[PDB]
Amino acid sequence: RISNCVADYSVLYNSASFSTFKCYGVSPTKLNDLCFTNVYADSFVIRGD
Amino acid sequence: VNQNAQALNTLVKQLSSNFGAISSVLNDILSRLDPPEAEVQIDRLITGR
Amino acid sequence: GYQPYRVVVLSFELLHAPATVCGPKKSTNLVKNKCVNFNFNGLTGTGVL
Amino acid sequence: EVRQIAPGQTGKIADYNYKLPDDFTGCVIAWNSNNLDSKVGGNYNYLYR
What we know:
This is part of a larger assembly, with four copies of chain A.
Chain A: E1 5-6, H1 9-12, E2 35-36, E3 39-46
């Protein structure tokens, strides 16, 4: 649970490593203006399929 | 007078409903999503109102 | 089909609450009696303050 | 990076190089030209802003 900081959501979108980038929540470029109340970052690794 | 003002009250109160969209604040959806999908979202919300 | 993909999901609990994290957009001082297109952490309305 | 060229995407392949309108009507065509485009010289003559 990341909180009380500033996030570089523009450049995060910029690294071309991201191959499956599905932003069902909101449009990617618009991650910059809105203020997120809180946030979780659930990380793991799964199959390619 | 009671019935007329109560009808108007229901009309105004109807604005809080998401009608199945992402939210009820029309400007929140504008800030969140992109035009090519705000299209369908705003479509649902507008047809509801 | 079986090349392991590292996957991170970023869930945002966007609602009306104390804003903790958002983008590095440059703030500016207020105004009174002059309607403005303000953005107070998602509250993207308009009006005098 | 072909699937990204579509009305409703943003990126190096979607907007930075060449755009598609949100009211476009037409047909995109993509096929595997890895036969001729495979250049022992590394085919670096193919550029993008």
